[PDB]
Protein: Nitric oxide synthase, endothelial
Organism: Homo sapiens
Amino acid sequence: FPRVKNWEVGSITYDTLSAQAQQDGPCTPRRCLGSLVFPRAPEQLLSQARDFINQYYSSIKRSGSQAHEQRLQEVEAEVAATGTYQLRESELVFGAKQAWRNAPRCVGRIQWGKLQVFDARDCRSAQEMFTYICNHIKYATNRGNLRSAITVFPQRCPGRGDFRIWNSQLVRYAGYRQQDGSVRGDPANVEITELCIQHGWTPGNGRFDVLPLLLQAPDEPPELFLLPPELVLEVPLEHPTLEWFAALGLRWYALPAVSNMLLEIGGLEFPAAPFSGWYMSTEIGTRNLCDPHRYNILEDVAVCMDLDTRTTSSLWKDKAAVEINVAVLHSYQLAKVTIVDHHAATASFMKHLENEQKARGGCPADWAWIVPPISGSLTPVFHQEMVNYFLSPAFRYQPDPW
Amino acid sequence: FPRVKNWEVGSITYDTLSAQAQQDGPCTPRRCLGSLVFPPEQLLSQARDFINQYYSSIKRSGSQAHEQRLQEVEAEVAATGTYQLRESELVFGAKQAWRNAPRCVGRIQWGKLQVFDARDCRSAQEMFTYICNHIKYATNRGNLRSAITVFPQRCPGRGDFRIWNSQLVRYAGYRQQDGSVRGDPANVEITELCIQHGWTPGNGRFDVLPLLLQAPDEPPELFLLPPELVLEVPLEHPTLEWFAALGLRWYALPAVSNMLLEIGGLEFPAAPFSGWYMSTEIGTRNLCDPHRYNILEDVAVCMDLDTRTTSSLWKDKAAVEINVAVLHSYQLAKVTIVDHHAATASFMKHLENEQKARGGCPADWAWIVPPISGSLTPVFHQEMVNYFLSPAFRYQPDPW
Ligand code: HEM
Ligand code: HEM
Ligand SMILES: Cc1cc(N)nc(C#CCN2CCN(C)CC2)c1
Ligand SMILES: Cc1cc(N)nc(C#CCN2CCN(C)CC2)c1
Ligand SMILES: C[C@H](O)[C@H](O)[C@H]1CNc2nc(N)[nH]c(=O)c2N1
Ligand SMILES: C[C@H](O)[C@H](O)[C@H]1CNc2nc(N)[nH]c(=O)c2N1
Ligand SMILES: [Cl-]
Ligand SMILES: [Cl-]
Ligand SMILES: [Gd]
Ligand SMILES: [Gd]
Ligand SMILES: [Zn+2]
């Protein structure tokens, strides 16, 4: 059992939960590959289902009971008859929460129990899918008082294709390859933008054009759906004391809603199950606006700030990035849209680790993703050793459907 | 062969050098422990391999001088059980241990290293003069030069040469009538050992500690460091005139003196090495870590920042100004220092060099990425592979 030290306080704990990791990651005793972004049959379906049913009945303080063994035999009977099985509603709710709880790269997991689960497993078409998605966005956005939510579409099943959302998030800004060779808008989204156009979207030419949705029903080409503008809540960016900042014309959207990941519960796979929370400000201020391969505004802000950009040792990059994050926090607070700064987020994650140590004997965590991209060692998670491993239920990456 | 991507550029390389990893790391397919700080005649195996390394590096594999050297180490171990490195090998192995250090961001410099051969040392008094030669050479009136001094290799039956201080320059840490510490809390322990062995404590928050030096099979001996030999930098800020009055200082020379150098199977428990500081080490970690000098709120009060809400980013603002003061102060004192933007950009160039030269480079992402402004640096966006190569610097137990 790995020993884990907090270097700020002196705390020492052991992660006994890692011993239960029943899927393998990319590291070996030869070489650690922890820094890599993408590090990745009825009997085996049965053993996954069995373990998850055990988890569920443990959670309802009913381990080993009549109802517990009843469900086991029921699931085996159904796999033997149909090749698969169906989750009960309460199991789907529990499994979606555990998948969030188990996500090693999520710093916001203190919230894991407060998750609205929308059961869309009856969804019939891409058009019904769109209506489900709009209701998710409306509920989650809640006029700026954001609420965590997931909508679960029908599971993968033999004999029919998958439901898929092609977009990586429900809200994304277009990225248009340009004049010279630049990108106008978000360079991360050049591919999905070109797919939308190919599928009949009439592009705009702004820097913050919200993308339409490409939604795939089983054994169907994807279908294009425009989001009503009044459903997509956005925040214009201003700075509390730098008045020229508003003239940058920058915006970001309220709702972070990941839509391209696969939800796995008890061996069943839901390739369409978009989930949303609220932003940590560094995601917007540091990564989305300052990454060199994203909006890349850092030098322009630093020039406007009259910083000396010809020498690195003036720390112009650091100073401009800090004020961009200030602008994000101030703008969302002004707009009354939920946001959490990286100091509050990491302190609440420390409490989650402590809650999880008592409840489960540990917590899977990916240090490089938990530590924020600015001011790392000023937050307490920097000084916390962590153990990264894969538990199920889980959210997993999956290939792009095109 | 692991695929390694740079997400800023989209470029891809493969790490073939990882296929040589000797000492196994702490990770398994089941769980990654990458964030954890501290995770007779088989001597011929590693000596053989190290000698082969040497002669390939000078393009002398499969030639007469190469075969000849293989036999002398054969005979030396057959006769005596251990072996002595040639001077050039001791030099080449020191530079390789540095080159192979996964957590070092300054390895672009690995080819420029001054090796002082103290292998004929024989007393704690001899050590002190060696250490003193190093410190004065490495400091060089503020034009810092990378240096390592290699004390004798450990042998069976006889004790070890050891430096009890973690570095050659450390500040004292004193407990109080209330537990809390005046000075550096990372050194409270070695501070209490120094006072135990007869050192008269100071009162200040930046008292340079004395050295506890350990000749084999003797108890340690205290040594006063020459004040004019410890170059220090008082801290001031270019525009915040009150920053000077906070009385902050730091020393010029980062000289790690508790690590064990391993070359060709041989083990040097006393082999202090030194370079120059990256400014975040001082400004962010040493001065702002909650368990170190923990000055962040004090600077924020002086800046009249809103410490009442985390969302003011008052910690971030104070931290950047402390780093600015470090860089400004060292530059004005003409003491070599490098900021984290320059350091990481040079490390990316090192990575490209090592890719063509050796097919990869062991790097510890969590330690290469600076502790402020991580994603503003290129190494944040660079995937890295961590593994152990030999020669190497290794951690070792405290000598008690
Ligand atoms: C409610 C507030 C939430 C906050 C503040 C938060 C915060 C974060 C942050 C900062 C990341 C890193 C993303 C990146 O750097 O690209 C992340 C990733 C992630 N979050 Fe959370 N999150 C929240 C809600 C949720 C919910 C509701 C779920 C699922 C039910 C979830 C599951 C995940 C997953 C699976 C990842 C990894 C995504 C990836 O690898 O690309 N999070 N979260
Ligand atoms: C020349 C300028 C150099 C710079 C700017 C530099 C920078 C750094 C930094 C910032 C660290 C991180 C350590 C920490 O944060 O605790 C480090 C670690 C390290 N460096 Fe360098 N370094 C330099 C030279 C050297 C030399 C000359 C050697 C040996 C010959 C060396 C060997 C190491 C080792 C072994 C570590 C790991 C220390 C540990 O694990 O505690 N470095 N270096
Ligand atoms: C639910 C949630 C809350 C929150 N604060 N952040 C995220 C995120 C993310 C990271 N995405 C992953 C997919 N990639 C294409 C874009 C970036 C998710
Ligand atoms: C050669 C070199 C150059 C440089 N810039 N930094 C280091 C370091 C370190 C890390 N120390 C290790 C000892 N511990 C007491 C404090 C932290 C080493
Ligand atoms: C290469 C490196 O692993 C990559 O840039 C990672 C590092 N840590 C991260 N952490 C978070 N939260 N989000 C990210 O996208 C990344 N990117
Ligand atoms: C807990 C965590 O692994 C630990 O604090 C590490 C992280 N990265 C680091 N990186 C450097 N350069 N120095 C350090 O001391 C640490 N500490
Ligand atoms: Cl995002
Ligand atoms: Cl230091
Ligand atoms: Gd102003
Ligand atoms: Gd004042
Ligand atoms: Zn690992």
